[PDB]
Amino acid sequence: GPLKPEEHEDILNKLLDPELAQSERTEALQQLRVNYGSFVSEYNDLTKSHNTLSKELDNLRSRFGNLEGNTSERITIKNILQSRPDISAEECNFLMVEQIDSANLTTLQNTVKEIVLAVGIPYPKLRRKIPLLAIKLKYENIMLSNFAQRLHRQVYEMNLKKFTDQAYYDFMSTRRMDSIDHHLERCLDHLYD
Amino acid sequence: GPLKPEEHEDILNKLLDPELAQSERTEALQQLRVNYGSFVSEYNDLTKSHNTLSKELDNLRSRFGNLEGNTSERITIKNILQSRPDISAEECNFLMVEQIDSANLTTLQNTVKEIVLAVGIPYPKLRRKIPLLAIKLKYENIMLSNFAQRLHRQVYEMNLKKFTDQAYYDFMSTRRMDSIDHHLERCLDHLYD
């Protein structure tokens, strides 16, 4: 590559020499000439390499930025406690809310895909309908089961969770929600009369 | 900055001159000297700037890589149709599955946070329990409601969805799942006898 500072400087010192042969003067100037063209070329090649690298880093910051989305609107424990007075810090911890911040995009995508397929609600509507699912699950189901339960006790308690586990066994062997035969149905009709 | 190739070359041409004054020879060599130290300095400064940029791009590829996670295990429409014979392309489209691939990390995090708070299942357990939620919602609830419904008809049809909308109204004004008074409860006891 280009000459080190000390090699260049030696040439300049040679050239100062008053008794340098003419051929020697020309040669040394030629070495300076050749060298400088090479230094300039190395330099320009560095200049394009630095700029290509600046291009790539800029796209990688935008690309990164878009898939991260707006940091500002992340829901925190603090936000949750604030906007949902029924939820404690203890519940947040038990539910492992903060661990969702460790998940990568592929994992979250897959998770959400599975929720959408399970609950039968289009993705763009899902957040809006999350309260409706909380209500089905934590209230109506429990009150609906209770009513059947209270009546089943005065006719004889149903083993509702035996039913549930059977329907999960069925789904896992089939991989079809379609054609689960939920035994709850049968026993409810035996209670119908 | 450093001299252009053509400016450098002029100096070399001056130096060739046989009748150049001694003072003139020294001066021109000094210009060459000063210039080369500057070129070398500019160069080294570019060399560290290129490398700092290479550092930053490398971290930005790892940082990006970790939050994207493994591209290979993304669930596709093709995967879904394959592993769930009960689900069609039409259902995938209606559910807008593919649109989940457009969501950023903040959005997916927030969505999952809301599911976990709504269904009361810790995050690390959520995927594993998604089939159980599908069963509660698509089977037991419907069979449980049916039983109450069939009995309510032969005693007089309950307006179950009037109940649901009221509990959602209550939740939206309160922001507490806690203290929803679901009217379903009341009417079920009026059917109890």
From Swiss-Prot, chains A, B:
Q: Where in the cell is it found?
A: Cytoplasm, Cytoskeleton, Microtubule organizing center, Spindle pole body
- Post-translational modification (record): Phosphorylated in its N-terminal part.
The domain of life is: Eukaryota
Q: What is known of its domains?
A: The length of the coiled coil are required to adjust the space between outer plaque and the central plaque.
Quaternary structure note? Interacts directly with ADY3 and YOR129C. Interacts with ADY4. Probable component of a SPB complex composed of ADY3, SSP1, DON1, MPC54, SPO21/MPC70, NUD1 and CNM67.
Q: What is the role of the protein in this entry? A: Involved in the pathway that organizes the shaping and sizing of the prospore membrane (PSM) during sporulation. Required for the proper formation of the spindle pole body (SPB) outer plaque. May connect the outer plaque to the central plaque embedded in the nuclear envelope.
Name assigned to this protein:
Chaotic nuclear migration protein 67
Native source species? Saccharomyces cerevisiae (strain ATCC 204508 / S288c)
- As recorded in Swiss-Prot or TrEMBL, the protein's gene is named CNM67
Give from-to of the shown chain within the full protein.
429 to 573 of 581
